[PDB]
Amino acid sequence: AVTTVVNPKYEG
Amino acid sequence: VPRGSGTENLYFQGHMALDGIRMPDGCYADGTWELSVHVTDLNRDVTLRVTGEVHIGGVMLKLVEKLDVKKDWSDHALWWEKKRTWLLKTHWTLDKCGIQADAKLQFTPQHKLLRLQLPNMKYVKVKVNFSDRVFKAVSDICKTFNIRHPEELSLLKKPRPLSPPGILAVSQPVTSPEILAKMFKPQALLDKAKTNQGWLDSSRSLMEQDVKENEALLLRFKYYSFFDLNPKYDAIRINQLYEQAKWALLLEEIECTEEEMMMFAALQYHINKLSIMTSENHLTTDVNPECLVSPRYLKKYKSKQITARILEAHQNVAQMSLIEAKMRFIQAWQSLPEFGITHFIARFQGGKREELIGIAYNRLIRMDASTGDAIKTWRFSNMKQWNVNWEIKMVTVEFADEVRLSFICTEVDCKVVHEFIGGYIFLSTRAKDQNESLDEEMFYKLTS
Amino acid sequence: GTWELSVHVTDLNRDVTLRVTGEVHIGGVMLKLVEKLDVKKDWSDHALWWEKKRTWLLKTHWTLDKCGIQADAKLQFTPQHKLLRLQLPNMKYVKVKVNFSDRVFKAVSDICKTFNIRHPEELSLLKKPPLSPTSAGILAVSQPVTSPEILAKMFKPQALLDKAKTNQGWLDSSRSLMEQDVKENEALLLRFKYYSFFDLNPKYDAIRINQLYEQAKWALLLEEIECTEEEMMMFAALQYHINKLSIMTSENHLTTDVNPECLVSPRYLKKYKSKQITARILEAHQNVAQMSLIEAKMRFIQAWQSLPEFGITHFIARFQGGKREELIGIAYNRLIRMDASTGDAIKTWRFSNMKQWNVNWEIKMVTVEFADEVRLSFICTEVDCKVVHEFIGGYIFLSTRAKDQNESLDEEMFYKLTS
């Protein structure tokens, strides 16, 4: 699988 | 193909009725079977008769019944080496945990002794819970040490004492010209980068990460972004950061020019003089109260009573100068052009050889693995998201103002890199107007 | 038709009489004096002074008629630049060459340039009831008291009313030293006058910081400002520490314990003789020790700035509706009506509120109008009336210093606010 982590600076 | 207990290929067919078409596999005439448990405290093995319906807490009680009925077993828990997991959900049945007669469990204190090498190079021993996530264990160790903002620190395995109150304030120079040279490991950049494979996983426990009981780990500042570093109450935190900076320069973990080295050396020499000043005794002929206080105090007190009050106040004054000088050393170190970069080995897409990914508080850097020369920099402020493909061990970073960045690391390096990026992103959300509102839930969501 | 004019040449203690008309120019009188006295000597610093009228005759294009000079006018012909003794905040005396005809605001600015003290508008000259620096060591001097016989012969156990009277001696910044009864070879005090210090920067204000530290130090030793016994002991320990740091800046190559093998990475030992490394460290240590010394002086200054009585300059005043003499206290942000016996603050008005303000010079009454509070009015003596006026205008002028505009000192703006 993959672990996608979004920079809170952008969404969430 | 993984075999045995706790896998998809168990050695015994479980859930067999005593009165089925034939007796259950590997069971005694009464339907029980033997679970062998190693009690680390006593270096002894103990066997229990159980079935699959017995609860984890049932196993623990059966063990305690067989061992000393007066001894304190309240700290012991079951550890399952093969599956690298503690068994703390005590209401689970052996069948739920996948536990058959082949399983080798340990009954062992959750709290153990752990040797730490501090940044000032001294060894301490602490009692820490080996079943807590390392994030919490580090936070608890820093509280014992009165070091604020534990999220900037972590634990690092040494590359291939004393039991806490005052060795944390120790700040002395190397003993010999040859004790210093003995510690100097003439290391290339790639070999420094390999050291960074030893940063512990903050989301897992010490037990799950191959830490012997009397193995020394390094307690180190991990993230080079120091929030509210305040001389008025961070004396210990400042001393340990200064010591980390002092050794990194003496040992060439970070380079500087010759003129900078002579400045850091004078500043270290000065700090050592100020430290002698905070403990110089028989401070007698120096203090002349007639020159230091207004004449009304002279007439109201005996000189040797004023001299005493002055020398008591001077202790705090000298400690402040000492802390300010260390702050200045840290600030000069922070201004070095490669400060704050942690290097990892990485193969960049379309690249010819192994290079480095450098991670800093505000950016990622592609660097040459021999010289450390920066090739390309990406700012976190332009980063939209990032992901790890754990199949091919590939990190991919997406941006708003250019095409994605992709690189390959070893499996160990993938986990560490992912936590560094997530960690620095977490630290960037710390706000001045705040209390110790360390959102633990947010750090875990970004680094796992 | 000519009439005679008595001009005294201070430079030669000789009196010279001149026949003049009245349509003659001031510049004309000057050239006649140069014809009668030495034709070789340099007279270009000399100007005409009129001691009876307390004024310089520095307009050469003007006529004797435009000046009201008649035959009853005894003038002087005298060097503008004269020797002036100064006691610095560190209590040391220096001599200086200053234009006794410039307005004192300009004299102070030029002295501070000579001494390398930035922001001269915070300093001024005060009358008390010697190396001779000229513009291109004594200003970085910070020595403890000589003996308990020197600190006690300096101590004046004076009440609060008496300190308020020393403030009569602040010079008019809009007038020259000559107009203010300052003799050559006589000592004025150079002091920080205003307690609002703009950009006090340890990176380059070493001298200005040293002198401000010394002023605070002495004010505390001489009880000109009071603090608690706990604070006095902290200040004493801090002064003791500063004197230790000061000694550390003179660490020579024979008293030194620098061990390079403990302070530098091994490649330096393998490349340089030990003596070369220590000399490099000792040279770098000078700036390092001087920086610790400056920071410690900054901490002393910052503790002094936090005292309850800090930064207040007192004057004797009769407030409207008051029954006796009290004190008007002037600080950088506020005006305080104070009891002259206890020093207690009775009422405080903030400069932020101050709409406008005027001085009735007939009855010597200062009046300050506010937006929230009712008018404040008080009467002072005639001298104290001029000094208080300058203090209020001066502090307003200092507040206008744009927090970071690095602008030139608006000299003309100052003069408008204090005249």
Author numbering:
A (entry chain C): 786 to 797
B (entry chain A): -14 to 145, 200 to 203, 218 to 336, 513 to 677
C (entry chain B): 16 to 144, 200 to 206, 219 to 336, 513 to 677
Direct quotes from the study:
Cytoplasmic adapter proteins including KINDLIN2, Integrin-β1 binding protein 1 (ICAP1) and to a lesser extend FilaminA were shown to bind the Integrin-β1 peptide in the proximity of the K794-containing distal NPXY-motif. Structural analysis of Integrin-β1 interaction with KINDLIN2, biochemical pulldown assay, and binding energy determination by using molecular dynamics simulation showed that acetylation of K794 and the K794Q-mutant increased KINDLIN2 binding affinity to the Integrin-β1.
Despite previous unsuccessful attempts when co-crystallizing Kindlin2 with wildtype Integrin-peptides, this strategy resulted in co-crystals of Kindlin2 and the acetylated Integrin-β1 peptide that diffracted to 2.04 Å. In addition, proximity analysis confirms that the Acetyl-K794 side chain makes contacts with side chains of F609 and S657, and the backbone of S610. The surface representation of Kindlin2 indicated that the β1-K794Q peptide is bound closer to the Kindlin2 F3 subdomain than the wildtype β1 peptide, and that the β1-AcK794 peptide fits the Integrin binding groove of Kindlin2 more snugly than the wildtype peptide. In all 5 simulations, the peptides stayed attached and the acetyl-lysine or arginine side-chains lodged deeply into the peptide binding pocket of KINDLIN2, contributing strongly to the binding energy (dG = −21.1 ± 2.5 kJ/mol and −21.6 ± 4.9 kJ/mol, respectively) as compared to the non-modified WT peptide (dG = −3.2 ± 11.9 kJ/mol).
